[PDB]
Design a binder for this molecule. Structure first.
Ligand code: NDE
Ligand code: NDE
Lengths: 349, 349
């Protein structure tokens, strides 16, 4: 079935750049799209201006997108639910505001699409695992790929993966999310673990790429970091029981290479500033958008230690981000290994 | 052993941007480096200016680099030979000027490092196979990775792969080419087929990335092209009997992602101009540097046909370059497939 599905209503819990961008996609597919934001005064401003002046400036909202601070008005009648709340705020949302949403989603068996990327600080859980404490796992699918919000929001060609345990669920969602003007194209997979691992780790690597840039290194170095970094995604995926199909697909390779290669990435930008010598405390004090890699770096290290997975690049980035290791010392220690084989396994016999 | 090796002399056959860049690397490892160039008047100019004003403007040559037009003086006493002559000119060099060089390399068993990328028009041969008509296989190794000439020549951090059938040869060359200031770092491998396929095909794909950019597409689109394109490298590598370890290594993923992402790529730049509406004939007449993808695209299609390997992106790129196909029509034909699975095989159970 290559034919598109359309809905009466979608709800997006996530008022940031990406939640808004995905609301813009859904506006083409749904009669009505509701976006939930926590602050009522800010909601009124966004609705009045027909522009998310908080988190996606310069993009006029479609008329069929409405912001609200009322969780129940947001989800009522929704036929798909998207979560795009940043990782470290997801749990709080369900604890504070999620009770009746949970009962609704369960009652009406509403598909949930997790678009958040990262690892939660103390629990070491991926976003879908956080959500899985509150909602049944069969309702949960994962969206992941190279999808900068500004390009997605304005309908510039974008490919993403949708992962679900059951491939027929992924294929249905692919028909809901994909657009007939071919601006947003989804590809189905079952590798939910590979998708979420790649998504979380790629943000940490992107800080590394930004550090390289800030230190005055070039495009050759960036390419080397992407290539060696993907190995870390691959090894963690294997240790966590993922089948690894996502690693060299849109969620892994595609998103990793995208995020490591542009200042549009908030994580890249954090890296650049660290490489130029700013402390993380000042970066984060003056930042108006979430850089998930910052909070992910520590729980990623703890998870990898637990599973005995060596992640040399992510380890040094963690040292820079959380232990104030001078980026030049981190670089030196990274390259202290001496000469080696590329060391990749054959794909073929 | 990971201690560096130093030579008395190296010779580089290839006076272009990359040959000159690699001579700059070798000037750190060798007492003397000779670069062969076909034209004596231009040789005198380069030597006088202490700058390759023909093909690498703005970079001052090390004092221990000398250009020459005399083949026999170039290789005399050299303990490594690099070939960096563009693919379509390699054969002519051996037929017209290579007789004594060939005897020297054989008699003294001098390691030869092939740095040229592409596929030769009539024969469908990779650069090491062309050279392999004249020099025996145990002397041939291949250099491949994300290594833009300007960054290499000026000592900005670069990683490359060196492939040889015997891993011990590759590891020896790695010790000769890698620098102690850690500016140029080599990784050993045996996947010579994978390296050379990736090197040839990535140039064609880079034209495609350029076309996307010239058509006004964004970074999300670029990431998708890189991800899908690598599958074509992978499939062709399998058909040609490579073990595929290089596909997601520096030669494949690394070099592809680099070349598809920067106007420093000659092939990207050709693509961009094609995407903007310029005919290939105008591009080629105002071109001051080789775009290997242009000439490669034809034999690449013939080889893929011969092997029954589908290469959907490379096919459309070939149509744009050789058959006057409107880039917008090529894009439409690419995007007419309907919704699919990502369809990558698992790496693990
Ligand atoms: N922005 C993107 O391009 C992008 C974003 N994501 C993910 O989307 C998630 C949402 O982040 P966002 O980009 O929408 O973030 P803003 O920083 O734009 O929004 C902040 C939201 O958080 C709320 N918020 C802020 N503070 C609080 C507190 N204290 N409490 C509760 N709620 C709060 C606020 O009200 C907004 O709703 C996050 O997990 C990202 O990893 C995935 C895909 C893409 C891209 O493919 C991508 O991955 C981009 O890479 P990158 O390197 O990430 O740019
Ligand atoms: N330039 C690079 O950054 C680069 C270049 N290469 C390869 O190096 C090989 C040599 O190319 P070059 O870049 O040095 O090319 P110039 O165009 O700089 O030199 C032309 C040479 O050809 C001679 N020449 C010119 N016309 C003739 C004729 N008619 N007869 C004989 N000899 C001739 C001339 O005298 C020079 O020696 C070629 O196969 C490339 O694929 C690999 C690695 C890198 C980079 O990683 C890389 O791959 C770059 O990607 P890209 O997309 O390619 O930019």
């Amino acid at each position: 079935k290559d034919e598109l599905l359309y809905l009466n209503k979608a709800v997006v819990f996530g008022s940031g750049a990406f939640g808004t961008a995905l609301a813009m996609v859904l506006s083409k597919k749904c009669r009505e799209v509701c976006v939930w934001h926590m602050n009522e005064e800010e909601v009124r401003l966004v609705n009045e201006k027909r522009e998310n002046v908080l988190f996606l400036k310069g993009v006029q909202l479609a008329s069929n997108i409405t912001f609200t601070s009322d969780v129940e008005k947001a989800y009522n009648g929704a036929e798909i639910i998207l979560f795009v709340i940043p990782t470290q705020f997801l749990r709080g949302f369900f604890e504070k505001s999620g009770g009746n949403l949970i009962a609704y989603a369960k009652e009406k068996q509403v598909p949930v699409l997790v678009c958040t990327k990262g690892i939660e600080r103390s629990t070491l859980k991926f976003p879908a695992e956080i959500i899985g404490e509150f909602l049944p796992s069969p309702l949960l699918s994962v969206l992941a790929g190279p999808s900068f919000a500004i390009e997605v929001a304005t309908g510039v060609f974008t490919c993403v993966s949708i992962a679900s345990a059951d491939i027929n669920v992924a294929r249905r969602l692919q028909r809901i999310m994909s657009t007939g003007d071919r601006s947003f194209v989804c590809w189905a997979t079952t590798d939910t673990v590979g998708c979420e691992v790649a998504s979380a780790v790629k943000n940490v690597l992107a800080i590394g790429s930004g550090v390289a840039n800030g230190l005055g290194m070039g495009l050759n170095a960036r390419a080397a970091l992407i290539m060696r970094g993907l190995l870390e995604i691959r090894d963690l995926t294997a240790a966590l029981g993922g089948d690894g199909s996502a690693v060299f697909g849109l969620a892994g390779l595609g998103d990793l290479q995208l995020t490591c290669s542009s200042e549009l990435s908030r994580n890249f930008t954090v890296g650049k500033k660290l490489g130029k010598g700013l402390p993380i405390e000042e970066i984060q004090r003056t930042s108006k958008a979430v850089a998930e890699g910052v909070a992910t770096a520590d729980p990623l290290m703890r998870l990898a230690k637990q599973l005995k997975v060596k992640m040399p690049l992510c380890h040094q980035i963690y040292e820079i981000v959380y232990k104030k290791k001078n980026p030049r010392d981190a670089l030196a220690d990274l390259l202290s290994c001496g000469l080696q084989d590329e060391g990749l396994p054959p794909l073929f016999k």
